[PDB]
Design a protein around this motif. Sequence first.
Motif, PDB file in Angstrom:
ATOM      1  N   UNK A   1       0.824  -1.204   0.000  1.00 14.87           N
ATOM      2  CA  UNK A   1       0.000   0.000   0.000  1.00 14.87           C
ATOM      3  C   UNK A   1       0.861   1.257   0.000  1.00 14.87           C
ATOM      4  N   UNK A   2       1.944   1.262   0.780  1.00 14.58           N
ATOM      5  CA  UNK A   2       2.812   2.434   0.798  1.00 14.58           C
ATOM      6  C   UNK A   2       3.399   2.700  -0.584  1.00 14.58           C
ATOM      7  N   UNK A   3       3.865   1.655  -1.266  1.00 12.05           N
ATOM      8  CA  UNK A   3       4.406   1.845  -2.607  1.00 12.05           C
ATOM      9  C   UNK A   3       3.369   2.484  -3.523  1.00 12.05           C
ATOM     10  N   UNK A   4       2.141   1.962  -3.519  1.00  8.88           N
ATOM     11  CA  UNK A   4       1.111   2.525  -4.389  1.00  8.88           C
ATOM     12  C   UNK A   4       0.773   3.959  -3.994  1.00  8.88           C
ATOM     13  N   UNK A   5       0.755   4.252  -2.692  1.00  3.96           N
ATOM     14  CA  UNK A   5       0.508   5.626  -2.263  1.00  3.96           C
ATOM     15  C   UNK A   5       1.611   6.559  -2.748  1.00  3.96           C
ATOM     16  N   UNK A   6       2.853   6.069  -2.779  1.00  5.42           N
ATOM     17  CA  UNK A   6       3.967   6.884  -3.253  1.00  5.42           C
ATOM     18  C   UNK A   6       3.862   7.177  -4.743  1.00  5.42           C
ATOM     19  N   UNK A   7       3.234   6.286  -5.510  1.00  6.77           N
ATOM     20  CA  UNK A   7       3.210   6.415  -6.961  1.00  6.77           C
ATOM     21  C   UNK A   7       1.962   7.101  -7.496  1.00  6.77           C
ATOM     22  N   UNK A   8       0.879   7.147  -6.719  1.00  8.83           N
ATOM     23  CA  UNK A   8      -0.368   7.764  -7.154  1.00  8.83           C
ATOM     24  C   UNK A   8      -0.826   8.886  -6.230  1.00  8.83           C
ATOM     25  N   UNK A   9      -0.046   9.225  -5.209  1.00 14.33           N
ATOM     26  CA  UNK A   9      -0.547  10.248  -4.321  1.00 14.33           C
ATOM     27  C   UNK A   9      -1.816   9.777  -3.626  1.00 14.33           C
ATOM     28  N   UNK A  10      -2.532  10.744  -3.047  1.00 14.98           N
ATOM     29  CA  UNK A  10      -3.759  10.450  -2.321  1.00 14.98           C
ATOM     30  C   UNK A  10      -5.018  10.941  -3.018  1.00 14.98           C
ATOM     31  N   UNK A  11      -4.894  11.835  -3.997  1.00 14.55           N
ATOM     32  CA  UNK A  11      -6.031  12.307  -4.783  1.00 14.55           C
ATOM     33  C   UNK A  11      -7.090  12.957  -3.890  1.00 14.55           C
ATOM     34  N   UNK A  12      -6.656  13.964  -3.139  1.00 13.64           N
ATOM     35  CA  UNK A  12      -7.573  14.741  -2.328  1.00 13.64           C
ATOM     36  C   UNK A  12      -8.127  13.980  -1.145  1.00 13.64           C
ATOM     37  N   UNK A  13      -7.872  12.677  -1.105  1.00 15.06           N
ATOM     38  CA  UNK A  13      -8.276  11.871   0.032  1.00 15.06           C
ATOM     39  C   UNK A  13      -7.298  12.069   1.184  1.00 15.06           C
TER      40      UNK A  13
END
Lengths: 305, 305
Positions: free
Chosen positions: B267-279
């Motif tokens: 999950x951390x890797x994906x968060x690093x690559x796509x940001x949070x998108x206003x979430x």
Amino acid sequence: SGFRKMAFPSGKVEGCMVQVTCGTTTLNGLWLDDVVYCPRHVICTSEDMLNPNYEDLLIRKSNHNFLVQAGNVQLRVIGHSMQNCVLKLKVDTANPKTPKYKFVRIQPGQTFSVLACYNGSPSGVYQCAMRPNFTIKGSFLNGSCGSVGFNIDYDCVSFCYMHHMELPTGVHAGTDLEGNFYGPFVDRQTAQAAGTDTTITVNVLAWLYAAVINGDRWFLNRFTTTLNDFNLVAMKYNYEPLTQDHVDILGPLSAQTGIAVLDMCASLKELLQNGMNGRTILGSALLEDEFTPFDVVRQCSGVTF
Amino acid sequence: SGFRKMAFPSGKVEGCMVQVTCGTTTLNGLWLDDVVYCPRHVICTSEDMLNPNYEDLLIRKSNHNFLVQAGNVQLRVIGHSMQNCVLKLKVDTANPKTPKYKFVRIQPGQTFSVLACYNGSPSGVYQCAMRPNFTIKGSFLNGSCGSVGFNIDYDCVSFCYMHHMELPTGVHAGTDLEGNFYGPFVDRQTAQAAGTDTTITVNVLAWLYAAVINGDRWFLNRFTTTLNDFNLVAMKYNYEPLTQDHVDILGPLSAQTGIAVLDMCASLKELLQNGMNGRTILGSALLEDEFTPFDVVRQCSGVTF
Ligand SMILES: COc1cncc(-n2c(=O)[nH]/c(=N\c3cc4cn(C)nc4cc3Cl)n(Cc3cc(Cl)c(F)cc3Oc3ccc(F)cc3)c2=O)c1
Ligand SMILES: COc1cncc(-n2c(=O)[nH]/c(=N\c3cc4cn(C)nc4cc3Cl)n(Cc3cc(Cl)c(F)cc3Oc3ccc(F)cc3)c2=O)c1
């Protein structure tokens, strides 16, 4: 330099936390002079919590039903009385560490320090804000009931909050030290919901001013706005309306930075419409609304960058 | 429920802050037993600060050159001595409010509570972290020199930080209570710069676990990662490498939530690559790295949602 959620030193309040027990119900209490304040919910047994008649349960209790423990020292109760949702237990010993204090009720948008307490022993301190819907987004676990919120003003402790309960949404509700709840909540173990919440506009602007004083300026602009045109944008984004009086309180911050309040409003409007684009303000990617104008002055230098 | 930057109650430390003066230089001191600890910089006059030889300035001083004020009570100095960057002033009175204490040095990534103090009187408390570059992002103004950081472990105060100076970047530097600086800094009024900073990976994961325990799960995924493939992504984003031992400390949080550490890494890797998108996660639009695994256990329920 720097900006951080800062709580008042909790020393003066630590010397007043006690444990209060009635039957098998136990919670935290506040010992000032020879009186102990705590939530009246303590007199409920498990089966009374769902729908209590407190003044019917209190007449059925005597002084010796209340065990008050200050550390390991047991205090003897010599009288009891009910004041709205707060129980007042008169003890035989006046607390020697009693500081100068007042009982004050805070308004929505104001901040205070919270001393989380369990079984009468404090475990942590942190800064909180009273939301416009009269809840607080604190950090509380089971047994925190009775914890108190406060501000400190030149040796004098202004007590302003006594924690009571957690809500289904995970927010917290309580009363002032007079027993009067904040918001439309009661002391019954039934599910109650908070009204819709709003953003404290004045606090946001104060936080933006804090940023400017600490060297940040990318969000500033050359545009200007009128009070009403801003309010029309704020309403669409669930922001509290800005009153002409709310502008006056921001005067000192406006003068120390040389940025007109309505100019700072212009930046807020643009921030609301374009987001921040991965950029940050004072290390935050959101617009912070839990710092009052007073908190900003309390922390930031009197001289801007 | 809830999650907030929480400081330890500062009461036990408040009773030890004193004001120390040498000539016209003044700063805060820590009075434990019959010794007063403070930065040796206090013995510098304005013209000595740019390039001092401290053991040359200390031989030129006598006991009666040091004024120690605990509140309004003046303490008499009966001996002095230098320990690295810390001056030790032996006084005639043992502090009656001296708590159990130790002197400990903290590692990069650990947290502590800071009691901001001015002229010997505390003004605020807040939680801090030791950055990987050995600075801290505190909130300090002029005169805060001498303020101390600490953790509290069952009545015992572990002192771990003594504030010294602010850096050009607005971060703060200091030493442990033995006088040994954190990082490659010295006590000279010259411009010194901090090394490049990194993100405390283990702390991020602990914060993600805190979110799960408090009911948030949108960032979770079904993908899995190996320790090395994660490290290759973390390095590209200026994250500290994750050691197999760093994984073990996250064991308790992994078991209480039932989420494998490497799954949380996915999950951390994906968060690093796509940001949070206003979430947001726990009310934050950034990934927070100032909560240790211990802070997460200290605050969150032992039972997940
Ligand atoms: C972690 O999350 C939390 C964060 N902060 C506080 C809590 N927390 C408690 O710690 N203890 C609570 N009850 C008690 C149970 C006890 C068992 N023993 C042996 N002693 C006791 C003393 C208390 Cl006080 N309660 C509920 C509550 C307390 C009060 Cl005053 C009240 F007037 C009504 C009420 O029921 C409600 C009300 C509204 C609602 F939406 C849900 C339940 C509560 O919420 C939990
Ligand atoms: C708001 O921002 C701040 C946040 N926190 C702390 C500060 N802060 C101070 O409050 N006071 C500082 N000096 C003093 C001046 C005094 C005048 N009087 C009458 N008494 C005094 C006592 C001190 Cl200690 N200093 C600089 C500093 C202190 C120490 Cl120990 C030192 F070893 C060297 C040094 O010079 C440097 C070093 C590095 C550098 F990058 C820049 C300057 C400092 O930085 C400012």
